[PDB]
Structure 1
Amino acid sequence: ATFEIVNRCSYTVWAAASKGDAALDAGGRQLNSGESWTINVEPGTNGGKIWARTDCYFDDSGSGICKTGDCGGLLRCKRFGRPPTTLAEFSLNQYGKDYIDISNIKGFNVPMNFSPTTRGCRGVRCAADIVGQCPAKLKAPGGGCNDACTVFQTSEYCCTTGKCGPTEYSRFFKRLCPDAFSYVLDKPTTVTCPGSSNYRVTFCPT
């Protein structure tokens, strides 16, 4: 499956793509404002994620740091990134279909649209100004709006017992972005697409 990752932000981002224990394609790359990076993701990838990283520094070897979404200091991510990270999430070729969503379970850093480029399902978008509106207790000094699990480390925010409900903090993300997951047991906003669809993730779509 091909994913075209497009940076429509006025600022440079460093895209990242991983299934948690491995890079997807190169794993990461710089995208200046307006640049497009096409990656190939193996069919049947389960639990894949694409995100943006902000305010990164990398040396010649591809090691450094990002203010948001840092993946162990690597340009070429092989693991998931450090919150806050708006997440484009996908499991492909799962019994004939692909499944896509946007999640704010790990916070929000950059606005995102995640849409098919092929026929047969709709896209999802979280493009509201979540950083600017972020509750004070969730604001990431590094930049971004953390989720409440990251900040407070409770069973209720992290849904550790599988019994949690919505919270004042999850309802903030949900209000700004109804089409993204706001907490682990949120009513799903997952979209069913044709198996072997192709996609585009646009940062700052508006």
Structure 2
Amino acid sequence: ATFEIVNRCSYTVWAAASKGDAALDAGGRQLNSGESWTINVEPGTNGGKIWARTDCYFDDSGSGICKTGDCGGLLRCKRFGRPPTTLAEFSLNQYGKDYIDISNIKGFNVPMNFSPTTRGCRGVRCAADIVGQCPAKLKAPGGGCNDACTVFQTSEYCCTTGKCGPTEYSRFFKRLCPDAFSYVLDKPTTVTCPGSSNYRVTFCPTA
């Protein structure tokens, strides 16, 4: 797939793209407000994620820190980022189809739209002001709104046994963003797209 990653936020973000044990394309890059970065994701990538990082500082070797979404201090991510991170998630060329979603299961930092740029399916979006409205006990001082599993580390929030139900915290993310996963066993909001579609992830898609 080709992904165009566009920062429509008024602040700089450092986009990241990884499948957990490797970078996708270069794995990360700075996007000033307005900039677009086109990456090539290998067909058949299963469990890929793209997210924004904020308030980062990197040295000339690409090593440093971000306040949200830091991936082991690298500009170019090889692993997933530290919550809170709104996630654009995808698995491509899986028995002829691609599957996309947005998830708040690892919290939320930056609003996002994740849409195909080719035919055949619809996009998904979580662009509500989740950081402004975040329950006090989930607020991340470093910036963003943490998920309840990150904050409290219980079997019920982290759905460790695969049992779990919705919670007062998952329901906040679901009320602000119905079309994103709010906890691990949420009713799925995954969209099926034709195999080998292309996509655009836009940070701060609205006002």
On whether the aligned pair clears a TM of 0.5, the verdict is yes
Question: Displacement of 1:161 after TM fit?
Answer: 0.8
- CA deviation map 1:67-102 (0-9, x unaligned): 000000000000000000000000000000000000
Cα shift at 1:131? 0.1
* Cα deviations by residue, 1:137-160 (Å, 9 ceiling, x for unpaired): 000000000000000000000000
Distance in 2, matches of 1:24 and 1:127, equals 24
| 2:80 partner SS | coil
Distance in 1, matches of 2:72 and 2:162, equals 29
Instruction: Give 4+ residue runs of structure 1 displaced > 3 Å after superposition.
Output: none
Q: What is the distance in 2 between the residues matched to 1:107 and 1:39?
A: 25
Instruction: State the partner residue of 1:50.
Output: 50
Number of equivalences: 206
CA–CA distance in structure 2, aligned partners of residues 178 and 47 of structure 1: 22
Q: Percent identity?
A: 100
SS in 2 for 1:66: strand
Distance apart, 1:171 and its partner CA:
0.1
Q: Partners of 2:122 and 2:20 in 1: how far apart?
A: 26
- RMSD of equivalent CA atoms: 0.2
* Structure 1 residues not aligned, in runs of 5+: none
- TM-score norm. by structure 2 comes to 0.99
Question: 1: CA distance between counterparts of 2:121 and 2:113?
Answer: 14
Q: Deviations over 1:33-76 (max 9, x none)?
A: 00000000000000000000000000000000000000000000
Deviation at 1:165, TM superposition (A): 0.1
Alignment of 1:14-163 (within 5 A): 14-163=14-163
The Cα offsets for residues 82-141 of structure 1, whole Å up to 9 and x where unpaired, read as: 000000000000000000000000000000000000000000000000000000000000
* CA displacement, residues 152-197 of structure 1 (integer Å, 9 cap, x when unaligned): 0000000001000000000000000000000000000000000000
* Cα deviation 1:6-45 (Å, max 9, x = unaligned): 0000000000000000000000000000000000000000
Residues in 2 aligned to 1:19 and 1:163: alpha-carbon distance in whole angstroms: 26
TM (norm. structure 1) is 1.00
User: Whole-Å Cα distance in 2 between the matches of residues 160 and 74 of structure 1?
Assistant: 29
Task: State the secondary structure of the residue aligned to 2:132.
Answer: helix
Stretches of structure 2 that go unaligned for 5 or more consecutive residues are: none
